[PDB]
Design a protein around this ligand. Structure first.
Ligand code: HEM
Ligand code: HEM
Lengths: 450, 446
C-alpha cells in the first residue's frame, strides 16, 4: 500500500538524484534497494518507477494506460516535433503517420532496404580489413557511423559518408548536440544557460534546413528511390485519406535518425562486448555466420537464417536495452497490482533493464549472458521482455533495427576473429540511450573476400 | 551423393528390419554401420534416418522443415486425436491449443503445480520407507506409478492412486494396451481391432466424464483442465472445445507419463552404476533440501541433479525419435537433394553419441558435460524435440524429475544389489526393464 521512495533533498525532493552522469544505472540501484515500485518526486513532478513483470504487465494494458511523454521526450519534441516517437496517441498526426509508415517498416519491407544496408555494412567490413597490424577498433564509434549512414540511405537516400570522416557531417553534429542539450536540461534556468539555448536553436535550424532541402529537392526531381522519403511522399492514410505534409515528413526523418541510430549502434556495441567476454557464445555465433553467409554479399533470406545471432542480439537487449525506459499515464482511476491506487493522469515509468532482471521470470542467473534463453521464443512470458516498448506505441523500427544488426553482426563474425586486447572494463555511458564507452577490440581478418 | 541403405528383403525392402523387439537399438546399430544418414524403404514409404549433429542442425531449420506425423504418431492419433502431439502444424487446433496451453506449462506455472507434485513424491518416499529389510524396489514400475499419478493430479485433479494398487486403474490398462496396439501395427487381427476400439471408448468415457463433472461443479482447481475450460486463444479469440480438451488430457497422460518415468529410471540406473556421480548428486540433495518438504525454489537449486537428468536424456532419450518433412525442395548437407514432402527421422540416441560433438567418451555418464549450455553446439541435444513443435511438457517433466530424484537422493542410500544388466525394453518409449535396487533409509523425517 505505502510506496517506497529514495532519499530526498529538502525542497528539491528526489530531483538531485538525477544529477549524475549514469542516471539509469542509479535508478536501477534504487530499484535494487526499494523493489518493484518506487515514487520519484521533483518540483511539480511525480512519477513511479516500475521494475517487476507483475506490475509492468498491468501498465502495458492499453485499456488502462496510454503512452506518456516523459520529460526527455518532451525536450526531444522541440526538434522531433509531432513525429511518431514524440506525439501523443490522441494527436491526429500520430495515427496518420502510423498508418502510412507501418507497411514500410514491416518484415516484408526489409527486403527493399536490404541492398542499402549491405552497402554500408560492406564499408564497415572494408574499413576493418584495411586496418594495420596492432591498430584497434573503437567499437561504438564505428557502430554509430554504420547505423547513422544506414538510416540516412534507407531513410532519404542521403549519404552522410561517415566512414570518410573524423568530424561527422554538420547535421550529425547538430543532432548530437541537440540530444545532449535535451539530456542536460533534465539534470538542471539561470542566465548561464543562455548560450546553450542559443546553440540549441541553431542546431534545430541546421537539422530542419538540410532535411527540408532534401524533401524539396526530391519533390522537384520527381525521382523514386527505395527509401522511406519516397513512401512518405506517395503514401495516403487509409483513415483520413490524407498524405503526410512536408513539415511532418521532416519530423519523421529527424525521428528516424534520433530514435534509430544510437539505440541500434548501442545494441551492436553491447552484443560485441558480450561476445568477446563469452568465447563459447562467440564460437557458436561465428559457426552460424560462416555456415549461413555462403556468398560474398549476404542476401535477405540468409540474414533471416542467422537464428543464433538473433539470440545473441536479444540477450544483449535483455541485459542493456538501449532505449532504457518508457512512460505511461493512467487513462482513468485504477488500482495497480491490487495495492497501488492511481488517479487519472498519474504517471508511470517502465525501467526496462530492471524488468529484464526480474528473477521471478528469468531465474537466478539474470546477470549472466546466455543467448540460449531465447532458443525457443515461446518460453518467454508476456511482457517480460520489452526492449521495443509496448502495444501500438511500440518501436516501429524494430524489424529494421534487428535486420540491420543481424546482418552486420553476421558479417563481422564471418569476416574477423576478435580480441579483447585491453581486457576492457564495461563502462556504460548514458545519453538518452546506453553504450559501452571506450570499448575497443582488435580484429584479425579471416581473409574472406567480398 | 549416393545415400546408404541397410539390407533389403526383396519386395518388402527394409521393412522386416523393424520386426524386432528393439527397433530403436537396431536402428542405432544400422547407423553405426552406415553413418550419419541412411535411406529406409518399405512398401509405400521412404524415410531417411539422421544421426549427426551436422545434418540434424539443418533438419531443425523451421524455414525448411516442419514436423511430420511418423507412422507411430499417426496410429497414436486414433486415440490422441488432434491433441498437441498428434496434430499437424497447419491444423487450426494445433496453434489454438499451443497458444492456450503454453502459459500453463511455463517455468512460472510449475510454482502452481509444485504442491501436487510433492503430494505424489511423498507417497513414493513413504512407500520405500515402509519396505521391510531385504525387500527391493522395482524402479520403472514405481517411477511410472509416480509420473502417472502426478499428471493425473496436475492435469485434471484426478487421483489414479497408483501406490494403492497392483492392477492399474482401468484407464491406464486401456491406454497401455492402446499404445501396445499402435506399436504392434508398425511391425505387421480382428480381435486386436475390436479390443483397440474398446480401449478408446474407456479413455474417452472417463475423460469426457471428468470434463462434464468439472463443468457441472463450476469448481476451480490448479490443474490444466481448469485452464483449458477458461482459456481463450489470443489469436482466434476461441476456446478449445470439449472434444479437443479430452484429446489434450489423453495426450498429457500418453506423452508425459512413460517418457518421464523412463528418465527417472535411467537416471537412477546411471547413478548406481557411477558411485562418484551418485555421491556428488546426494551431497547436493542434502545441502539444498534442508526442509522436510522441498520448495519450488529449492528444486531450482538442484543444479547437479538437473545435469544428471540431462546426461541421462543424452544417453537414452525416452522419446527416441521425431519426424520432419521438407517444406520445399532443398539440399541437405550440401550433398543430399530432397524434394518437397520428403521425410526425415531424427534418431536422437545416435545424435547424442556424435563424437565430433561430445568427444571420444560418448558412452560415459558425465553430468559435467552440461555445466554450460553455451559450450554445447547448436542442435546437438534434442531430447525434447525442436522449435515450435518441441515438447510443451519439458519444464513439467524436468521439475517433477528433479524434485523426485532430489528427494530420493536425500532420503535413501541405494544398492545395485543384483549388479543389474541394462536391458532396454522398447514400446514407443524406452525403459530399463527389470531394473531393481535396494534402498536403505537415512531415517530423515518428512
Ligand atoms: C535496437 C534498436 C532500437 C530500440 C531498442 C528501440 C526502442 C524503442 C522503444 C522502447 C520505443 C518506445 C518508446 C516509448 O514508448 O516512449 C521505440 C519507439 C520508436 N522507435 Fe525505436 N528502437 C530501436 C530502433 C529504432 C529504429 C532503427 C527506428 C527507425 C528506423 C526507430 C523508430 C522508432 C519510432 C518512430 C518510435 C515511435 C513509434 C510510435 O510511437 O508510433 N527505432 N523504440
Ligand atoms: C522426459 C520426459 C519427456 C520427454 C523426453 C519428451 C519428449 C518429447 C518430444 C521429443 C517431443 C516432440 C515429438 C515430435 O516432434 O514428434 C514432445 C512433444 C510433446 N510433449 Fe513431451 N516429453 C516428455 C515429457 C512430457 C510431459 C510430462 C508432457 C505433458 C505434461 C509432455 C507433452 C508433450 C506434448 C503435448 C507434446 C507436443 C507439443 C506440440 O507439438 O505442440 N511431454 N515431447
Amino acid at each position: 500500500k505505502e510506496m517506497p521512495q529514495p532519499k530526498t533533498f529538502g525542497e528539491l525532493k528526489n530531483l538531485p538524484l538525477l544529477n549524475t552522469d549514469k542516471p539509469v544505472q542509479a535508478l536501477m540501484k534504487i530499484a535494487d534497494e526499494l523493489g518493484e515500485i518506487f515514487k520519484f518526486e521533483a518540483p511539480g513532478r511525480v512519477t513511479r518507477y516500475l521494475s517487476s513483470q507483475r506490475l509492468i504487465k498491468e501498465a502495458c494494458d492499453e485499456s488502462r494506460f496510454d503512452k506518456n511523454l516523459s520529460q526527455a521526450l518532451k525536450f526531444v519534441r522541440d526538434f522531433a516535433g509531432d513525429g511518431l516517437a514524440t506525439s501523443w496517441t490522441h494527436e491526429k498526426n500520430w495515427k496518420k503517420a502510423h498508418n502510412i509508415l507501418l507497411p514500410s517498416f514491416s518484415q516484408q519491407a526489409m527486403k527493399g532496404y536490404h541492398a542499402m544496408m549491405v552497402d554500408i555494412a560492406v564499408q564497415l567490413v572494408q574499413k576493418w580489413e584495411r586496418l594495420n597490424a596492432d591498430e584497434h577498433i573503437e567499437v561504438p564509434e564505428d557502430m554509430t557511423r554504420l547505423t547513422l549512414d544506414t538510416i540516412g540511405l534507407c531513410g532519404f537516400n542521403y549519404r552522410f559518408n561517415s566512414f570518410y570522416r573524423d568530424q561527422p557531417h554538420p547535421f550529425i553534429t547538430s543532432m548530437v548536440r541537440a540530444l545532449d542539450e535535451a539530456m542536460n536540461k533534465l539534470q538542471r534556468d539561470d542566465p548561464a544557460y543562455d548560450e546553450n539555448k542559443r546553440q540549441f536553436q541553431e542546431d534545430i535550424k541546421v537539422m530542419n534546413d538540410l532535411v527540408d532541402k532534401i524533401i524539396a529537392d526530391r519533390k522537384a526531381s520527381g525521382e523514386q528511390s527505395d527509401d522511406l522519403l519516397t513512401h512518405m511522399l506517395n503514401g495516403k492514410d487509409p483513415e483520413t485519406g490524407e498524405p503526410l505534409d512536408d513539415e511532418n515528413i521532416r519530423y519523421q526523418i529527424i525521428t528516424f535518425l534520433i530514435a534509430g541510430h544510437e539505440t541500434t549502434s548501442g545494441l551492436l556495441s553491447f552484443a560485441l562486448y558480450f561476445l568477446v567476454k563469452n568465447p563459447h557464445v562467440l564460437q557458436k555465433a561465428a559457426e552460424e555466420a560462416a555456415r549461413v553467409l555462403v556468398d560474398p554479399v549476404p542476401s535477405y533470406k540468409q540474414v533471416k537464417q542467422l537464428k543464433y545471432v538473433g539470440m545473441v542480439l536479444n540477450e544483449a537487449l535483455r541485459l542493456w536495452p538501449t532505449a532504457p525506459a518508457f512512460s505511461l499515464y493512467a487513462k482513468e482511476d485504477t488500482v495497480l497490482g491490487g495495492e497501488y491506487p492511481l488517479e487519472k493522469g498519474d504517471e508511470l515509468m517502465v525501467l526496462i533493464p530492471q524488468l529484464h532482471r526480474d528473477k521471478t521470470i528469468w531465474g537466478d542467473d539474470v546477470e549472466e549472458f546466455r543467448p540460449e534463453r531465447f532458443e525457443n521464443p515461446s518460453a518467454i512470458p508476456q511482457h517480460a521482455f520489452k526492449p521495443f516498448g509496448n502495444g501500438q506505441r511500440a518501436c516501429i523500427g524494430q524489424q529494421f533495427a534487428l535486420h540491420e544488426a543481424t546482418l552486420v553482426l553476421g558479417m563481422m563474425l564471418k569476416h574477423f576473429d576478435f580480441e579483447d586486447h585491453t581486457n576492457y572494463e564495461l563502462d556504460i555511458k548514458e545519453t538518452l540511450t546506453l553504450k559501452p564507452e571506450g570499448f575497443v577490440v582488435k580484429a584479425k581478418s579471416k581473409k574472406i573476400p567480398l
